[PDB]
UniProtKB/Swiss-Prot annotation:
Belongs to the CLASP family. The chain holds residues 63 to 308 of 1294 of the full protein. This is CLIP-associating protein 2. Transmembrane segments: none annotated. It is found in: Cytoplasm, Cytoskeleton; Cytoplasm, Cytoskeleton, Microtubule organizing center, Centrosome; Chromosome, Centromere, Kinetochore; Cytoplasm, Cytoskeleton, Spindle. The two SXIP sequence motifs mediate interaction with MAPRE1; this is necessary for targeting to growing microtubule plus ends. It comes from the Eukaryota. Residues 1-246 are annotated as: TOG 1. It comes from Homo sapiens.
Length: 246
């Protein structure tokens, strides 16, 4: 987990060094990158290189050009297609690039995050560990750097997935979100948050329960009154499972 995020961070900059010579030149470069990624029939390694190139551009200061953000949205279709590849290494590069974009751009990647997150969630239950872990890491990087309130319903929704692994990962994501986001970014989803956490605390799966309990700490932090009300309604054994670390 922590190891996955560290490998991601290292992969962010472990790409070819490059320089941008003009706004127009940057656009030419981005257009070519989009062409390469838009056709899933193009040699997979060449598509991987195109994904790394985006990171090379980030390292080179592309975020300082207004045209970059224009092209960012133009690339959403290409990024989604890349993250949907059947080849684990392509999916990995795509997730790393998505994570890097979020890390560098922060809230300026709001549109990109919304556009890509559902695709990343589809990777979570994937049997190939390379794809699953890459998707999970990319989501965690987004949660920490691009706070889009619309991402909450997606997370809480997946906390109720029939897929157990998906539930475990989703409560983990919610736990992170509450530790990261400002209360004002959460206000509009207080109800769904309380409800999702209440259900999670009683999850049939032990691991999912461990995560729902961590998330409860976050609920107390941002919505103390609601957290207390939730606690006072539970059975003794479950109230005890929520005891503060001592």
């Amino acid at each position: 987990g922590a190891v996955d995020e560290d490998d991601f961070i290292k992969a962010f900059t472990d790409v070819p060094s490059i320089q941008i010579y003009s706004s127009r030149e940057l656009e030419e470069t981005l257009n070519k990158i989009r062409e390469i990624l838009s056709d899933d029939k193009h040699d997979w390694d060449q598509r991987a290189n195109a994904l790394k190139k985006i990171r090379s551009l980030l390292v080179a200061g592309a975020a300082q050009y207004d045209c970059f953000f224009q092209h960012l949205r133009l690339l959403d279709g290409a990024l989604k297609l890349s993250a949907k590849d059947l080849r684990s290494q392509v999916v990995r590069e795509a997730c790393i690039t998505v994570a890097h974009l979020s890390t560098v751009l922060g809230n300026k990647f709001d549109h990109g995050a919304e556009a890509i997150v559902p695709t990343l969630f589809n990777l979570v239950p994937n049997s190939a560990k390379v794809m699953a872990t890459s998707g999970c890491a990319a989501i965690r990087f987004i949660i920490r750097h691009t706070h889009v309130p619309r991402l909450i319903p997606l997370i809480t929704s997946n906390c109720t997935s029939k897929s157990v692994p998906v539930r475990r990962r989703s409560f983990e994501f919610l736990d992170l979100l509450l530790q990261e986001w400002q209360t004002h970014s959460l206000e509009r989803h207080a109800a769904v948050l309380v409800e999702t956490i209440k259900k999670g605390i009683h999850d049939a799966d032990a691991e999912a329960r461990v995560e729902a309990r961590k998330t409860y700490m976050g609920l107390r932090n941002h919505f103390p009154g609601e957290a207390e009300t939730l606690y006072n309604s539970l059975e003794p054994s479950y109230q005890k499972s929520l005891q503060t670390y001592l």
